[PDB]
Nucleic acid binder design. Structure first.
Ligand code: Q8R
Ligand code: K
Ligand code: K
Length: 545
DNA sequence: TTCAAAAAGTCCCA
DNA sequence: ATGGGACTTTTTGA
């Protein structure tokens, strides 16, 4: 329940907020961490503040009460007026209280530490500086009773499949003083995700974003499966609204290459570019000028989107795959009439242009009429998981029978020629499915609308969609999930724009040559690459890049 | 009635 | 033991 931020990142975040504080003008800054834990950030804040006061102690002594401003009084002053923390964990607060006390009895020094829920606490005043690492909890792992509170009181940033850390962004922004500075490390996903749309709008319209450090898929928290970014923002009145963006170039680097994070940011391991906050739409397209030019050329030249021409759908969700998915060689399939059996593939079965042969079968149990006619299937296959099946939401409410698929969709959508792609991948992998393949939600499908069949063929679409141009084009705005993994979900895949011009026939012909080679017995994988290079050239010519 | 989003992923191995 | 690679379920709000 407690996560330790790497020291190099803590120091960078504390420096980002305090390095230019004018302690002579304001010797009473309020610095807050609302998920302080054991004080990873606040103990560093103490050290930075102590040097700031000690370095200017005689100037403060002359300007203000000369009896109050002594070196011996710095410790008490910092704890009384400067450092604030909050955390839900009582033990963590107790440890941090001891650590702050031991930085140096008399009249006991009051320490501004609150054991509370920071999202419910009535905050009695605003703060100059806010730093830290909020909790990340998604829609599956968040308690449903608590979600009702968030859906009611944090509706500006929290809806649907949003995350708990969205609300910490809102709370931090709301209690930041005018002219104050906030700097936090959170997951990166809100920068592109559909769930983060309202959160992005709230940030854009209430603070100036000074800086975004985007580590992409790099592993910042050891043994933790999350991807991180650092956001620095302020509430200063300024006419300029440009964001510094530092995007890592190599996801494999060790974060401790130099003594400081800023050395790494200035190095060749990162790229830097600027983004005008006023030009942010509901989506934040954070790319350099070359990629922006590349992206805008494709957007302006393409007159159609996939959503215009195609029908998208998520795959089957059985609710318990072990109950319904069997190996095609499993002897228990002899109990199942073939009318109930469907071919079943996983995301790893999707290559560019074609799907591997299926190794698994789905029992489409929705077509089982009653429990008496097919008792052996129920007793010997599906019923082996009956307890877990009955715990599915729609079974408890009586919507589904215990042996039915939870979301069986429409068979007719799958039993047709269609394009399939994995939901998470390192590259564009769009394949024509010829074999009426079914799949779980790790594979998405679409088919072309009837009225667009004379303009776009399946063979033409997989040709451009698998090209190097469209791989780079999709990843410009794609949701980066982990190292070498992007989400390929319809909320972004169906926004891909496509074109139709004089190169259509040759692109389509090259695609059919590739498909014909890939479907042979002795695949000339080499020839396919050459044909792909030729198609990439045609596509680059068509789009004027 | 029934869609589609969601990595403090999950699991294994050298 | 850890860090890195292959691979991806079903719960959930709307
Ligand atoms: O690294 C994460 C750190 O953040 C702390 N923390 C977690 N949730 C907190 C919170 N409100 C949400 C309560 C909450 C959380 C989950 C479910 C229901 C309610 N208010 C303050 N601090 C919090 C953890 O102690 C840890 O030290
Ligand atoms: K004085
Ligand atoms: K990561």
């Amino acid at each position: 329940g407690i996560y330790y931020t790497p020291k190099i990142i803590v120091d960078y975040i504390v420096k980002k907020t305090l390095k230019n504080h004018d302690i002579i003008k304001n010797p009473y800054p309020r610095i807050l961490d609302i998920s302080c834990g054991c004080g990873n950030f606040l103990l560093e804040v103490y050290d930075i503040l102590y040097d700031l006061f000690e370095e200017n102690i005689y100037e403060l002594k002359k300007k203000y009460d000369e009896n109050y401003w002594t070196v011996d009084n710095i410790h008490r002053h910092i704890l009384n007026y400067c450092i604030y923390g909050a955390d839900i964990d009582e033990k963590a607060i107790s440890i941090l209280k001891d650590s702050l006390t031991n930085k140096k009895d008399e009249s006991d020094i009051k320490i501004n530490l609150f054991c509370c829920d920071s999202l419910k606490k009535k905050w009695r005043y605003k703060f100059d500086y806010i730093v830290g690492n909020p909790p990340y909890i998604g829609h599956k792992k968040l308690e449903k009773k608590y979600k009702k509170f968030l859906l009611e009181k944090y509706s500006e940033v929290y809806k649907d499949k949003a995350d708990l850390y969205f609300c910490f962004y809102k709370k931090i922004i709301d209690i930041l003083k005018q002219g104050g500075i906030g700097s936090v490390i959170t997951p990166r996903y809100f920068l592109e995700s559909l769930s983060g749309k309202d959160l992005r709008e709230y940030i854009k319209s209430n603070v100036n974003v000074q800086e975004i450090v985007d580590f992409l898929g790099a592993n910042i928290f050891k043994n933790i499966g999350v991807s991180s970014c650092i956001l620095t923002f302020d509430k200063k009145k300024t006419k300029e609204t440009y964001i510094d963006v530092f995007k890592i170039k190599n996801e494999d680097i060790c974060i401790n290459k130099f003594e400081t994070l800023e050395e790494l940011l200035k190095s060749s391991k990162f790229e830097h570019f600027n983004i005008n906050q006023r030009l942010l739409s509901d989506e934040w397209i954070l790319v350099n000028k070359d990629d922006e030019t590349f992206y805008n050329k494709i957007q302006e030249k393409c007159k159609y989107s996939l959503e215009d021409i195609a029908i998208s759908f998520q795959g089957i969700i059985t609710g318990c795959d072990k109950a319904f998915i069997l190996s095609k060689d499993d002897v228990k399939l002899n109990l199942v009439d073939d009318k109930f059996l469907k071919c079943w593939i996983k995301s790893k079965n999707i290559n560019k242009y074609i799907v591997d042969k299926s190794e698994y079968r789905l029992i489409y149990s929705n077509d089982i009429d009653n429990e008496n006619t097919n008792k052996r299937i129920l007793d010997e296959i599906i019923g082996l998981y009956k307890t877990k099946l009955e715990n599915r939401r729609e079974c408890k409410s009586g919507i589904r029978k215990w042996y039915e698929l939870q979301w069986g969709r429409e068979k007719l959508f799958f039993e047709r020629k269609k394009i399939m792609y994995p939901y998470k991948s390192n590259e564009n992998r769009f394949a024509i499915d010829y074999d009426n393949n079914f799949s779980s939600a790790d594979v998405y499908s679409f088919f072309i609308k009837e009225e667009y069949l004379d303009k776009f063929s399946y063979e033409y679409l997989v040709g451009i969609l698998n090209s190097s141009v469209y791989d780079k084009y999709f990843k410009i705005t794609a949701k980066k999930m982990s190292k070498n993994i992007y989400d390929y979900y319809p909320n972004k895949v169906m926004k891909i724009r496509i074109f139709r011009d004089n190169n259509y026939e040759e692109i389509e012909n090259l695609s059919k040559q590739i498909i014909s080679i890939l479907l042979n017995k002795s695949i000339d994988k080499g020839k396919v690459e050459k044909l792909q290079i030729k198609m990439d050239n045609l596509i680059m010519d068509s789009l004027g890049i």
